[PDB]
Design an enzyme around this catalytic site. Structure first.
Site, short mmCIF file in Angstrom:
data_model
loop_
_atom_site.label_atom_id
_atom_site.label_comp_id
_atom_site.label_asym_id
_atom_site.label_seq_id
_atom_site.Cartn_x
_atom_site.Cartn_y
_atom_site.Cartn_z
N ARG A 53 0.81 -1.21 0.00
CA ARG A 53 0.00 0.00 0.00
C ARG A 53 0.84 1.27 0.00
NH1 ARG A 53 -2.58 -3.77 3.08
NH2 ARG A 53 -4.78 -4.19 2.58
N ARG B 181 -9.72 -11.58 3.09
CA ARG B 181 -11.08 -11.82 2.63
C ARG B 181 -11.61 -13.17 3.09
NH1 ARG B 181 -11.63 -11.90 -3.65
NH2 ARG B 181 -10.66 -13.95 -3.31
N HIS C 188 -8.25 -19.13 -14.24
CA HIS C 188 -9.29 -18.66 -13.34
C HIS C 188 -10.64 -19.21 -13.78
CE1 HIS C 188 -12.20 -15.93 -11.46
NE2 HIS C 188 -11.27 -15.70 -10.55
N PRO C 189 -11.30 -20.03 -12.96
CA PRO C 189 -12.58 -20.61 -13.37
C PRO C 189 -13.60 -19.52 -13.69
CG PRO C 189 -11.71 -21.78 -11.49
CD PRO C 189 -10.84 -20.57 -11.67
N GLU D 174 -18.92 -24.06 -11.47
CA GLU D 174 -18.79 -23.56 -12.83
C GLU D 174 -19.93 -24.07 -13.71
OE1 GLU D 174 -16.69 -21.26 -13.76
OE2 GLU D 174 -15.92 -21.22 -11.70
N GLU E 285 -23.64 -16.16 -8.49
CA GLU E 285 -22.80 -17.12 -7.78
C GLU E 285 -23.55 -17.86 -6.68
OE1 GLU E 285 -19.33 -15.36 -6.09
OE2 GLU E 285 -18.48 -17.26 -5.40
N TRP F 227 -11.59 4.22 8.01
CA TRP F 227 -11.43 2.85 7.52
C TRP F 227 -11.07 1.90 8.65
CZ3 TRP F 227 -12.72 -0.04 3.56
CH2 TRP F 227 -12.06 -1.27 3.36
N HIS G 94 -11.75 -5.91 -6.84
CA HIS G 94 -13.06 -5.42 -7.24
C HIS G 94 -13.15 -3.90 -7.14
CE1 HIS G 94 -13.78 -9.68 -6.32
NE2 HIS G 94 -14.79 -9.60 -7.17
N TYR H 65 -21.28 -10.05 -2.95
CA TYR H 65 -20.74 -11.15 -2.17
C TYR H 65 -21.42 -11.28 -0.81
CZ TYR H 65 -17.02 -11.24 -5.66
OH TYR H 65 -16.31 -11.32 -6.84
#
Lengths: 99, 597
Positions: free
Chosen positions: B151, B255, B327-328, B357, B384, B459, B487, B497
């Site tokens: 960062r 994540r 990447h699927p 998938e 998804e 933040w 993203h 998500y």
């Protein structure tokens, strides 16, 4: 959509079978001939018509279709469209849409 | 004569012309991803620009048909998307400069790298380089060097590029009659035109905030358990009532906590369910992996896969000569052409990923009969979500023993399932707080409630309160944490998500009630049950043509999101974690910091 007393785009605006039609229907997959790499636009269809075609009637008129009351005069524009449309043909298309 | 007839005419001719250009645009991207060549790179730009300019040309004629004279709901929905001008509302300079910021921020993300402090010569890029090292790295300094230094040259340098992204995108929302850019993404859930099912855009902030309150007791116990196992490593920096370090989450952005499942295993004296060694002895390849999954969709009543689907699939990467992205991804082009590009190895995850998938492809087959503009999910969370319910059914020991992967004598008890729920909790319960935390921060910055100088102050201030994570090294307003995220830098929806977790669980509880399965929810298996497939197929073919609130009622019988299915599926794990946390303190405090003593 091919049968006595049917409906839809191809039946009404292209080819229709009368209720008394005594004939038969035959079809087979042309994806191995007609469809080619890059697409084949040689085969088109009439998307729009002011009404439904009559039994055993063929109209090749290319006159522009007028959706509303706005004059067209053969010039594409607002409320003016070209009725004929080309069928997309490629070997990668789904079996359902294969020609 | 009426505008309705003229609107339906414009919509009929639009689907045909848009289906031909859209199929060629997606087809060009396929040849580019499957094979990297100078011809495919140009075809993607030409085909991409031809389709991109198509909507811009049709949008001019779409604004000439007001929706006030249209009494058809399906007609207004098709014109609702065409009425938007996209970037046309922005000024010539702001419109062209927007693409430069997106391309500049996206380029720094892929080209960004952090040189090894100990080896200045070797400089590793973030992906895979920095994402793989941080996964298995147990070192405190090794993880802090790559986490803190990234960062510095990224978050700090992306701040000026992110500021323009905030001002530029806001001008687009204001021209669209939107309160702000934050409300732009909430428009996906907007529901209007149906009496009683109307869903306001502002109601999303209250739903996500109201449902998160019930997840706190489940996440607080899951966080206290993770801090207890890692408390022996660094007792000074890790307080019992404090928060865990930000760089120890197991990956770069923290994540998913799945990487910590190794050290968090409750019982190490018992075996775990793995199909890797079982599939090796069975001698299976990528060809039979998808074939076994195709029979699963048939057991529930869903149609099988077309011949062209399995013939055009890409099962591996033929070396560096012809390279593709592993990447699927599920690619839906059109005209019944469905394909999937993924690198297929032999692993327990690839088997579960195969169902995911394939779920996207199977989901695209139901609504494929809808118009071009009407082909899509009811929202951004159903894409998804439908694929996760399929993977959750395969991970159950009942489904594995059916096809013969797991031995029939394998003992299934609390000790076996308790370890399985923890693995799924880190990937599920772990993303929820991080999703609501980052998504809520973007809505506040874009809305104008947080001054530019408080971006970082708010933040971390909201991070310890939400996810309970503190920064080892304090940062000023120069750094931008979301700027480094995938993203956030690519201008993709980050809220999809969060809702995916609530939607996938609702269908899991509803589909298992139709199949008449008894016992815990994680023991449910939808295989061999044709009654649950018929109920889910109704909504699968609806897509976005109907309000997501109405379609959701025909499945789970609910008019909005609910956390109830989240507590039941995780109920067995909550009861066990509550006892193990009795010796510790449940929850964390926001007044503790690693550098403040």
């Amino acid at each position: 959509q091919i049968a006595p007393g049917q409906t839809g785009k191809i039946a009404d605006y292209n080819y229709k079978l009368p209720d008394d039609f005594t004939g038969c229907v035959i079809a087979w997959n042309s994806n191995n001939l007609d469809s080619k790499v890059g697409g084949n636009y040689n085969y088109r269809y009439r998307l729009f018509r002011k009404s439904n075609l009559k039994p055993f009637e063929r109209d090749i008129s290319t006159e522009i279709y007028q959706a509303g009351s706005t004059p067209c005069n053969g010039v594409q524009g607002f409320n003016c469209y070209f009725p004929l449309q080309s069928y997309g043909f490629q070997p990668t298309n789904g079996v359902g849409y294969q020609p | 004569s009426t505008i309705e007839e003229q609107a339906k005419t414009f919509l009929d001719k639009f689907n045909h012309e848009a289906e031909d250009l859209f199929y060629q645009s997606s087809l060009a991207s396929w040849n580019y991803n499957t094979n990297i060549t100078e011809e495919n790179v140009q075809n993607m730009n030409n085909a991409g620009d031809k389709w991109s300019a198509f909507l811009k040309e049709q949008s001019t004629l779409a604004q000439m048909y007001p929706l006030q004279e249209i009494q058809n709901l399906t007609v207004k929905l098709q014109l609702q998307a065409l009425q938007q001008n996209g970037s046309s509302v922005l000024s010539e300079d702001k419109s062209k400069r927007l693409n430069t910021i997106l391309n500049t921020m996206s380029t720094i993300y892929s080209t960004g790298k952090v040189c090894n402090p100990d080896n200045p010569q070797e400089c590793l890029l973030l992906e895979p380089g920095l994402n793989e090292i941080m996964a298995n790295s147990l070192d405190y300094n090794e993880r802090l060097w790559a986490w803190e230094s990234w960062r510095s040259e990224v978050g700090k340098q992306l701040r000026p590029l992110y500021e323009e992204y905030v001002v530029l995108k806001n001008e687009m929302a204001r021209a669209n009659h939107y309160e702000d850019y934050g409300d732009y993404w909430r428009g996906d859930y907007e529901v209007n035109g149906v009496d009683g099912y109307d869903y306001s855009r502002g109601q999303l902030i209250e739903d996500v905030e109201h449902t998160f309150e019930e997840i706190k007791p489940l996440y607080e116990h899951l966080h206290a358990y993770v801090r207890a196992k890692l408390m022996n490593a660094y007792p000074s920096y890790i307080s019992p009532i404090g928060c865990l370090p930000a760089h120890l989450l197991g990956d770069m952005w923290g994540r998913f906590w799945t990487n910590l499942y190794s050290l968090t295993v409750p019982f190490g004296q018992k075996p775990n369910i793995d199909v890797t060694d079982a599939m090796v002895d069975q001698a299976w390849d990528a060809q039979r992996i998808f074939k076994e999954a195709e029979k699963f969709f048939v057991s529930v009543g869903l149609p099988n896969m077309t011949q062209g689907f399995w013939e055009n699939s890409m099962l591996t990467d033929p070396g560096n000569v012809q390279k593709a992205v592993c990447h699927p991804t599920a690619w839906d082009l059109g005209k019944g052409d469905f394909r999937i590009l993924m690198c297929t190895k032999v692993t327990m995850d690839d088997f579960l990923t195969a169902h995911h998938e394939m779920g996207h492809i199977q989901y695209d087959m139901a609504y494929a009969a809808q118009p071009f503009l009407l082909r899509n999910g009811a929202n951004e969370g159903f894409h998804e979500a439908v694929g996760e319910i399929m993977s959750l059914s395969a991970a159950t020991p009942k489904h594995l023993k059916s096809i013969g992967l797991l031995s029939p004598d394998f003992q299934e008890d609390n000790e076996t399932e308790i370890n399985f729920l923890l693995k799924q909790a880190l990937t599920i319960v772990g993303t929820l707080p991080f999703t609501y935390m980052l998504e809520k921060w973007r809505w506040m910055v874009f809305k104008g409630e947080i001054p530019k100088d408080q971006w970082m102050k708010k933040w971390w201030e909201m991070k310890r309160e939400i996810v309970g994570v503190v920064e080892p090294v304090p940062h000023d307003e120069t750094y931008c944490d979301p700027a480094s995220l995938f993203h956030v830098s690519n201008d993709y929806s980050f809220i999809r998500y969060y809702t995916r977790t609530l939607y996938q669980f609702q269908f899991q509880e509803a589909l298992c009630q139709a199949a008449k399965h008894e016992g815990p929810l994680h023991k449910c298996d939808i295989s061999n049950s044709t009654e649950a497939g018929q109920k889910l197929f109704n909504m699968l073919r609806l897509g976005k043509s109907e309000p997501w609130t109405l379609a959701l009622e025909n499945v789970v019988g609910a008019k909005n999101m609910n956390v109830r299915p989240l507590l039941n599926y995780f109920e067995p794990l909550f009861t066990w974690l509550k006892d193990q946390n009795k010796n510790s303190f449940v929850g964390w405090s926001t007044d503790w910091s690693p550098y403040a003593d």
